[PDB]
């Protein structure tokens, strides 16, 4: 009973674009708390939406396991931005600056990973509209 309704296909694709917008808003806009928390909630919902889609393609395509090992570059994007921010703050508060560095890099991978999925979304949208 796969709820693969076109209304879902539309959302999954539309989530890939919004997920990138999240990172841009986080980088550009100097959000503080209340408005910053709302941003991360939106991102969390988006990552879950994309969380499902990925697990789905995983199960079918030659069954789970095998698939994931080929699409690891897609994992970093599936990490909620608010989760990394939360972690970085906790790490800095403990003076674990060496780790803050690595967490920094993980954030870079998250951005690249979402950018990758961003391009796929656009390319796919172009196909549904003007097939080729």
């Amino acid at each position, epitope marked *: 009973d796969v709820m693969e309704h076109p209304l879902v296909e539309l959302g999954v694709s539309y989530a890939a674009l919004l997920s990138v917008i999240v990172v841009v808003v986080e980088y550009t806009m100097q959000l503080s708390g209340e408005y910053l928390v709302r941003l991360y909630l939106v991102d969390l919902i988006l990552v879950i939406i994309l969380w499902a889609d990925y697990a789905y393609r995983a199960y079918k395509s030659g069954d789970p396991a095998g698939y994931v090992k080929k699409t690891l570059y897609e994992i970093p994007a599936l990490v909620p931005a608010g989760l990394l921010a939360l972690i*970085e703050g906790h790490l800095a508060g403990l*003076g*674990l*600056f060496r780790l803050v560095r690595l967490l920094r890099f993980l954030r870079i991978l998250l951005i690249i990973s979402r950018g990758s999925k961003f391009l796929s979304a656009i390319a796919d949208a172009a196909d549904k509209l003007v097939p080729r």
Partner: antibody
Amino acid sequence: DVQLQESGPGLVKPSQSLSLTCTVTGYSITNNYAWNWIRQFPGNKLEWMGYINYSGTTSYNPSLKSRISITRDTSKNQFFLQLNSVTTEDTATYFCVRGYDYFAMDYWGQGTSVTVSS
Amino acid sequence: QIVLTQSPAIMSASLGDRVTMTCTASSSVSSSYLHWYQQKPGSSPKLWIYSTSNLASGVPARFSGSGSGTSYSLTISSMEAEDAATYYCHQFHRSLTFGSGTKLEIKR
């Protein structure tokens, strides 16, 4: 070669505000770590006052919370200390210091003497 | 927020003597956050030993740090004239606090 240098008036009147500047060279205060203000009293007791880290968040000594403020100017790679309503007991040598991993203070400024007197 | 009591407050040792000083905490301190500093009159303190037992770059092998929980120590296998100074321990738990210091003098 990381280097910190403190600057500002060495004399302040009671009730007024004490302001010091730390200019850092050889490393960017926005890159990583904590940037502290630590003072040492005439009897040589050391006391951590607070810091502002690479991301701009501040942390203060609870006994100074209501009187202090640490800010920064990233374009000049400097951070500042402001201690309000100072009294005779705030007379001490003030150090700007870098807080490395686990808050080990690896680089200290040479320190500046501040006297609070009328 | 813990209090670090250093002992002895003041001590003197003959050049060549083994030297041991202690840092006692009011509550348990994580070994990764216990650091020692050496300071001589007229200059700023220098990181000497970090995370309980790691000697700072320029620090001679005669020095060593040990301990855990609420009890740490700094030892000098053999006292040299340049070791005369005041040593401070430091810790972080909820806040940053410094020990009362141990002033090491030369015995003659």
